[PDB]
Structure 1
Amino acid sequence: SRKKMGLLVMAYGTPYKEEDIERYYTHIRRGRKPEPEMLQDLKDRYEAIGGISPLAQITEQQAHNLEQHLNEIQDEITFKAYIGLKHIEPFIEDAVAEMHKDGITEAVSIVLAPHFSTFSVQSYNKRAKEEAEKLGGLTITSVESWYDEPKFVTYWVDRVKETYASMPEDERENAMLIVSAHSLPEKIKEFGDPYPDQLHESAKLIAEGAGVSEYAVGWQSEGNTPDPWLGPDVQDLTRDLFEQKGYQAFVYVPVGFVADHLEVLYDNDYECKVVTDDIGASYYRPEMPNAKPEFIDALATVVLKKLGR
């Protein structure tokens, strides 16, 4: 009696093993293979964060739990999850072609990145729809953003509350909250890309809900191109804020990311920790959503709301 629908879960993607590093970054670098020294460094970074194997598993677990949960909280639709990635197989097109072959005719998509941007989200959705249009007989409704879903805000608000609560007294009174997301080229502004504003809005909503009056907005993990990228970078912001007010502790909320991957386990947990360790301040970074029940419910609500349920 249920209506069959495809659940297209898209994401950036991650290597499955150390030997994937080369091709994964070549793709990210738009066809330019990393030099020998860079390849070695990347391997060292992944080893330092506990290994690669767990990365892709988080995404698979996210897609799977979301599929099971949605199927349990409503009784009108039966969802079937398909993972589509940008930088490694299964690619976005591959997932769409599979849904078609399996007989899916109606699907709903969601990107594992809360803020809309013309660079990624719009591109992912555009590519999924074009593949479906090319195959025919299949339509897709795409979630464009969900950073403002109350349940998602609540997740971070609660994590931040716990973090400040566990803080000593003299730290709680001189702590700074830094909310960040993946940095992108500044040129996106020429299209009126709401990306920057959505990050600032997430920061305001999380700070307000947690009761934190002192916070800043930062970017991280910027790529390497001649054109300028959104700033300031979390590393510089941390130092700059310290040099002007001398905070004793920094709380990092990489709201732009949803899992324990390299741009949090290393770009925050290591690179940011280096700076805080250097200035003599305490480092804090709340648990990422990953595949936890609270997060999966938030995502389920996002999907159902998109479908008018």
Structure 2
Amino acid sequence: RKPKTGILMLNMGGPETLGDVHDFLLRLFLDRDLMTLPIQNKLAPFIAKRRTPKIQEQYRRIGGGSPIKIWTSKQGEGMVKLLDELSPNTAPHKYYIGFRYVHPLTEEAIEEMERDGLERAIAFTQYPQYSCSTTGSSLNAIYRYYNQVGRKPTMKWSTIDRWPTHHLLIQCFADHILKELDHFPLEKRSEVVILFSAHSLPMSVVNRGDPYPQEVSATVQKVMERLEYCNPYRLVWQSKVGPMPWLGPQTDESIKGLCERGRKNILLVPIAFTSDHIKTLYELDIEYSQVLAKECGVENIRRAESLNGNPLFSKALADLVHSHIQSNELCSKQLTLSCPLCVNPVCRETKSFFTSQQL
């Protein structure tokens, strides 16, 4: 049966092998939508080269590359299975991987979907909380694909641009948080502090009205209500890059400060991620949970596991897509409003791409 409905899963993607680090970093640092940089065209290549070495080593420490693709596939296939059931009308569903900086690119995926004669195309961001640096960059990519070529899509487009508090996403974290707590020494459980560690963002993005911080906070809030405040929690931000100011307490300094102030049982939560990768397997698990945990004298530092293959997460993907169709909305109401202090001409256009759509 010809693929009828296509769900394009968008995420950043990551180096599969150490040989893919450099090219990945070059594209990444060249992307002005992720973050603005002085003379990006020239600085990026410079940054990519100097950085490739240590990043390659990091990828070696965790296998030789990022698992993001494998996790994304497993998730989509499960999704399709359920879609091909919940919504029998939308005939066969086919998932498509659209990584921002690694072939399977967004452009290769669009080309591919068009080549399948799909009548429906759904841009489904894998970033639950919206940032103009992530979903906004993946979306502009979709828009640009058509703009540059100068042709209109042969399919109907719609987009699930965000899903901060999907009740099934929330249940996954809460659940994962309960089996972790269950493995801390019983007499130390109620002392464990829960650190939600969301990727951080330059203050240049946050200060321009970016939606991200608020929604991550929303995700954080739902989870804790679901766990009915069983433990103290704090929202911290990780993975800062470069000299410029970035948001809220860094996770590293937070784990350190807690440790030095009496709180030595910490539970980390990948609140803004959907699978394992360098950010968890190496940064949180090795850098903080091993090295930093050791230097400060942590009694127990554990990490709630990543959604990854959790069927309940697949359940959630499909449910979101299903509700999406049923609703016939072209995008979320929030998307129809660009950042208060936006200065990216593409944004306003990418917005039309989905709002000014038919069917």
The TM-score normalised by the length of structure 2 is 0.79
Which range moves more in the overlay, 28-37 or 231-240? 28-37
Deviation at 1:34, TM superposition (A): 4.9
* Contact 1:178 1:215 (C-alpha < 8 Å) held by counterparts: yes
Given residue 284 of structure 2, which amino acid in structure 1 is its aligned partner? N
Given residue 10 of structure 2, which amino acid in structure 1 is its aligned partner? M
* Contact 2:22 2:49 (C-alpha < 8 Å) held by counterparts: no
Which range moves more in the overlay, 124-133 or 158-167? 124-133
* Contact 1:22 1:33 (C-alpha < 8 Å) held by counterparts: no
Q: What does residue 229 of structure 1 align with?
A: 246
Give 1:262's match in structure 2, choosing from 269, 278, 282.
278
Q: Matches of 1:239 and 1:178 in 2, distance apart?
A: 12
Q: What does residue 316 of structure 2 align with?
A: 298
Residue 167 (str. 1) matches residue 184 (str. 2): yes
Q: Matches of 2:48 and 2:105 in 1, distance apart?
A: 25
Q: What does residue 146 of structure 1 align with?
A: 163
* Contact 1:15 1:52 (C-alpha < 8 Å) held by counterparts: yes
Deviation at 1:218, TM superposition (A): 0.8
Cα RMSD after superposing both structures: 2.2
Residue 81 (str. 1) matches residue 95 (str. 2): yes
Mark the CA change 1:63 to 1:227 in structure 2 (over 3 Å): closer, same or farther.
same
Q: Matches of 1:73 and 1:162 in 2, distance apart?
A: 30
How many aligned residue pairs are there? 307
Deviation at 1:53, TM superposition (A): 6.3
Q: Matches of 2:85 and 2:46 in 1, distance apart?
A: 45
The TM-score normalised by the length of structure 1 is 0.91
Q: What does residue 340 of structure 2 align with?
A: none
Q: Matches of 1:177 and 1:286 in 2, distance apart?
A: 10
Q: What does residue 26 of structure 1 align with?
A: 26
Which range moves more in the overlay, 246-255 or 130-139? 130-139
SS at match of 1:32: helix
Which range moves more in the overlay, 172-181 or 148-157? 172-181
Q: Matches of 2:48 and 2:169 in 1, distance apart?
A: 39
Q: What does residue 103 of structure 1 align with?
A: 117
Q: Matches of 1:69 and 1:56 in 2, distance apart?
A: 20
Given residue 265 of structure 1, which amino acid in structure 2 is its aligned partner? L
Q: What does residue 12 of structure 1 align with?
A: 12
Deviation at 1:261, TM superposition (A): 0.4
Deviation at 1:256, TM superposition (A): 0.7
Mark the CA change 1:108 to 1:38 in structure 2 (over 3 Å): closer, same or farther.
closer
Given residue 223 of structure 1, which amino acid in structure 2 is its aligned partner? V
Which range moves more in the overlay, 35-44 or 187-196? 35-44
* Contact 2:258 2:264 (C-alpha < 8 Å) held by counterparts: no
Mark the CA change 1:304 to 1:114 in structure 2 (over 3 Å): closer, same or farther.
same
User: Unaligned regions of 5+ residues in structure 1, if any?
Assistant: none
Given residue 152 of structure 1, which amino acid in structure 2 is its aligned partner? L
